[PDB]
Write an enzyme that holds these catalytic residues in place. Structure first.
Site, short mmCIF file in Angstrom:
data_model
loop_
_atom_site.label_atom_id
_atom_site.label_comp_id
_atom_site.label_asym_id
_atom_site.label_seq_id
_atom_site.Cartn_x
_atom_site.Cartn_y
_atom_site.Cartn_z
CD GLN C 54 14.58 -28.50 86.32
OE1 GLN C 54 14.19 -29.66 86.50
NE2 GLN C 54 13.80 -27.45 86.49
N1 LIG Z 1 3.41 -39.35 77.51
C1 LIG Z 1 4.63 -39.14 77.01
N2 LIG Z 1 5.65 -38.85 77.83
C2 LIG Z 1 6.90 -38.71 77.35
C3 LIG Z 1 7.15 -38.83 76.05
N3 LIG Z 1 8.47 -38.70 75.87
C4 LIG Z 1 9.02 -38.50 77.06
N4 LIG Z 1 8.05 -38.50 77.97
C5 LIG Z 1 8.21 -38.20 79.41
O1 LIG Z 1 8.59 -36.83 79.65
C6 LIG Z 1 9.09 -36.79 81.00
C7 LIG Z 1 10.39 -35.99 81.02
O2 LIG Z 1 11.37 -36.61 80.18
P1 LIG Z 1 12.89 -36.08 80.22
O3 LIG Z 1 13.61 -36.61 79.04
O4 LIG Z 1 13.44 -36.36 81.57
O5 LIG Z 1 12.71 -34.49 80.05
P2 LIG Z 1 13.99 -33.54 79.91
O6 LIG Z 1 13.57 -32.27 79.28
O7 LIG Z 1 15.08 -34.32 79.27
O8 LIG Z 1 14.38 -33.25 81.44
P3 LIG Z 1 15.37 -32.04 81.82
O9 LIG Z 1 16.33 -32.02 80.69
O10 LIG Z 1 15.96 -32.46 83.11
O11 LIG Z 1 14.48 -30.86 81.89
C8 LIG Z 1 9.36 -38.23 81.39
O12 LIG Z 1 8.27 -38.75 82.17
C9 LIG Z 1 9.39 -38.92 80.04
O13 LIG Z 1 9.09 -40.31 80.18
C10 LIG Z 1 6.18 -39.11 75.18
O14 LIG Z 1 6.42 -39.22 73.98
N5 LIG Z 1 4.87 -39.28 75.64
#
Ligand SMILES: Nc1nc2c(ncn2[C@@H]2O[C@H](COP(=O)(O)OP(=O)(O)OP(=O)(O)O)[C@@H](O)[C@H]2O)c(=O)[nH]1
Ligand SMILES: Nc1nc2c(ncn2[C@@H]2O[C@H](COP(=O)(O)OP(=O)(O)O)[C@@H](O)[C@H]2O)c(=O)[nH]1
Ligand SMILES: [Mg+2]
Ligand SMILES: [Mg+2]
Lengths: 171, 351, 160
Positions: C54
């Site tokens: 974030q």
């Molecule tokens: N379409 C698609 N979505 C993805 C892919 N990999 C992850 N996502 C989606 O990306 C979104 C965020 O994933 P997170 O891992 O929560 O992102 P993050 O950066 O770890 O979140 P924070 O660390 O809290 O910012 C989710 O809906 C995942 O399912 C992908 O390869 N393709």
């Protein structure tokens, strides 16, 4: 491909003004309140026959509460039509009909077939929108407005096929 | 002569999902787990559950934030029996309990032996169950908060008209059948989808007349019925029942899996699977302390993730909150006073 | 091995961390705190530390620099508008003397999306190419499936 057409219709409008009752009477020829408020997006199908063509339909229903605005936008994409329904008994739902049209522009395709509908006309005693008042804003924008009712089945078949043809024009 | 409560606690302790059950027994368990009603949890608690069985027994399971599971029971001969529990990857205890927890991802649960998804009835029968399972506390921003935006709690009343008589209600374990709800829907002055509770029903709640009736037409001991009467007499009760039916409480969770939720709608529209949009299972309990807790989880068919193809399940968007002693059934107070906690969970059939 | 997962928000970090710990994909939720699990692949144990991305809790990444054996910088191959915002943080990370010495694995996540960005592209975009005197790699992956996620692990193993 046993079908000649595949059209996707979306129903938007204030919550409580019968977007489901109009989607059920058209798909299943029924009406009842034994159903709970739609949560998110509903999906039904009803194949028709017009101009000697297999017109398979894919109607997508959406909630009305202002909060479901952001989530519903992800559906205006591949929309071949948008039936902005409003309650002809609730003045409020009649004013917002303009706002729902705006949402359409921001999200739905520039050439989306806009079809206005005033449902719940059977309750004329508690009605507030004259066929003329509405038809005014409607005809002012090229929107085939029709007064329907999912209870009496009035124009349910008519006002619905209207989109099935209005769309066949662009194709 | 193992008391009813003692049974459930014994099962949940060994594993409600233990495959060794002859199935015949699964039926024996479902009847008990569906009696667990989430009630107002104490300050240092993360979730409290209560259940009043027919053998006069009673169960009270608590879950501190330290995830400590303490339980108390009372046999028909009022024999206070306190038993400390522990949950491991074997029995998945902390899973078979209606408690929203902090999880990095939406909790995933597996149904039992036969539960199948076909007709309207088959849907409710499943939600009855999942609603008794854990969930994942989903955060909400000012943009997705069911109590923010231009018109907060606007359809709270109309959402109830088409809600009552078609949902699984529960007031202190006392199941509220269909006819029962339809009776309430009247006392609440909710006729058409445009009306609002009478000015009197807001300041004074449900008249002692209608209220007393609703009870008589509800499952529960004479002793229990009386309680439902004392509850449906306070102005607060009205605010608690009309709010629980809110439709936007699903926004927090939906905005997370609304995509996979539609994929499930498609697999059904083509399969002609006669199944309604969603189902509501509410549980309202008022502690002897006076506090009013309302837990309303909605059910919706959802398609499993990518790795597991053609496997359908049901999402259980739960929403629990308290009813301040004073909050009257008015579109306004409901928005300023109440602070709902949103959490859902995906449950997939055993196939 | 003490691995530290970092990267812009909605990049797909938690989706990966728990994608290995469970094998099956789950509906990740916005990480406000920090997820830390332990996976064991190739007969080697990994200690992943997924920290929120974030715009707010970005500065708390330094409180994790020390004791870092490797840096797994996940990148959304589709969010071009913020693809640069990545090299901004990435550089600020691999520079601080704390982590001035650790293997660096860059995940090209979301390779399934149409606007997919080829690896060799992210390589020059993030600014990994010009920067040498360090060990790194750009591994193409899709958290929603598991492609590259395991090979990216085998990388850390062989390169240490
Ligand atoms: N379409 C698609 N979505 C993805 C892919 N990999 C992850 N996502 C989606 O990306 C979104 C965020 O994933 P997170 O891992 O929560 O992102 P993050 O950066 O770890 O979140 P924070 O660390 O809290 O910012 C989710 O809906 C995942 O399912 C992908 O390869 N393709
Ligand atoms: N009397 C009457 N009521 C209707 C009619 N159509 C809809 N309604 C009311 O609207 C409710 C259901 O409409 P609904 O589908 O929930 O509106 P939506 O949620 O915006 O799609 C019912 O409880 C009816 O009282 C109608 O033709 N006649
Ligand atoms: Mg609807
Ligand atoms: Mg995260």
């Amino acid at each position: 491909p046993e079908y000649d057409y595949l059209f996707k219709l979306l129903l938007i409008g204030d919550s409580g003004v019968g977007k489901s009752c109009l989607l059920l009477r058209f798909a299943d020829d029924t009406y009842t309140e034994s159903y709970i408020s739609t949560i998110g997006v509903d999906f039904k199908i009803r194949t028709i026959e017009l101009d000697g063509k297999t017109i398979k339909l894919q109607i997508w229903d959406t909630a009305g509460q202002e909060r479901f605005r952001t989530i519903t936008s992800s559906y205006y994409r591949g929309a071949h039509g948008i039936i902005v329904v409003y309650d002809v008994t609730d003045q409020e739902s009649f004013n917002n009909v303009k706002q729902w049209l705006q949402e359409i522009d921001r999200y739905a395709s520039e050439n989306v077939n806009k079809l206005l509908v005033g449902n719940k006309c059977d309750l004329t005693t508690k009605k507030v929108v004259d066929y003329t008042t509405a038809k005014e804003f409607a005809d002012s924008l090229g929107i085939p407005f029709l007064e329907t009712s999912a209870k009496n089945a009035t124009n349910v078949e008519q006002s619905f096929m209207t989109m099935a043809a209005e769309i066949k024009k662009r194709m | 002569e193992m008391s009813c409560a003692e049974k459930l606690l014994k099962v949940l302790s060994f594993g409600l999902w233990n495959p060794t059950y002859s199935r015949s027994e699964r039926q024996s368990f479902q009847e008990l787990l569906t009696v667990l009603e989430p009630v107002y949890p104490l300050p240092n608690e993360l979730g409290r559950v209560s259940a009043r069985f027919s053998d006069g027994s009673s169960l009270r399971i608590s879950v501190t934030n330290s995830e400590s599971i303490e339980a108390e029971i009372r046999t028909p001969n009022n024999e206070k029996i306190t038993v400390l529990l522990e949950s491991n990857e074997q029995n998945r205890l902390l899973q078979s309990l209606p408690i929203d927890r902090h999880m990095p991802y939406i909790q995933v649960h597996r149904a039992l032996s036969e539960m199948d998804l076909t007709d309207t009835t088959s849907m409710r029968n499943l939600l009855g169950f999942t609603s008794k399972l854990s969930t994942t506390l989903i955060p909400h921003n000012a943009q997705t908060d069911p109590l923010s935006g231009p018109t907060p709690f606007s359809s709270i009343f109309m959402d109830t008209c088409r809600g009552l008589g078609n949902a699984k209600l529960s007031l202190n374990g006392v199941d509220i059948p269909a006819n029962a709800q339809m009776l309430l829907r009247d006392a609440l002055g909710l006729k058409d989808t445009h009306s609002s509770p009478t000015r009197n029903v807001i300041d004074h709640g449900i008249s002692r007349h209608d209220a007393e009736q609703i009870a008589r037409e509800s499952s529960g001991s004479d002793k229990q019925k009386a309680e439902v009467v004392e509850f449906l007499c306070h102005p607060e009760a009205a605010t608690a029942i009309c709010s629980a039916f809110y439709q936007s409480f699903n926004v927090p969770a939906l905005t997370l899996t609304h995509e996979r939720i539609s994929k499930a709608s498609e697999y059904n529209a083509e399969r002609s699977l006669d199944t309604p949009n969603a189902c509501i299972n509410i549980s309202i309990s008022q502690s002897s302390d006076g506090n009013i807790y309302v837990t309303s989880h909605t059910g919706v068919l959802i398609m499993a993730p990518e790795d597991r193809p053609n496997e359908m399940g049901m999402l259980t968007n739960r929403t629990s909150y308290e009813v301040p002693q004073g909050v009257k059934c008015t579109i306004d107070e409901m928005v300023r006073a109440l602070q709902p906690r949103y959490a859902a969970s995906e449950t997939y059939l055993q196939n | 091995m003490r691995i530290l997962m970092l990267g812009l928000d909605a990049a797909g970090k938690t989706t990966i961390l728990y994608k290995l710990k469970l094998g099956q994909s789950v509906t990740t939720i916005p990480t406000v705190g920090f997820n830390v699990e332990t996976v064991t692949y190739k007969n080697v144990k990994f200690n992943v530390w997924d920290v929120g991305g974030q715009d707010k809790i970005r500065p708390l990444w330094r409180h994790y620099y020390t004791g870092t054996q490797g840096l797994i910088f996940v990148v959304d191959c589709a969010d071009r508008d913020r693809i640069d915002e990545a090299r901004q943080e990435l550089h600020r990370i691999i520079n601080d003397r704390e982590m001035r010495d650790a293997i660096i694995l860059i995940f090209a996540n979301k390779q399934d999306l149409p606007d997919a960005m080829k690896p060799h592209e992210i390589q020059e975009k993030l600014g990994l190419t010009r920067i040498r005197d360090r060990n790194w790699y750009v591994q193409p992956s899709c958290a929603t499936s598991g492609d590259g996620l395991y090979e990216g692990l085998t990388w850390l193993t062989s390169n240490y």
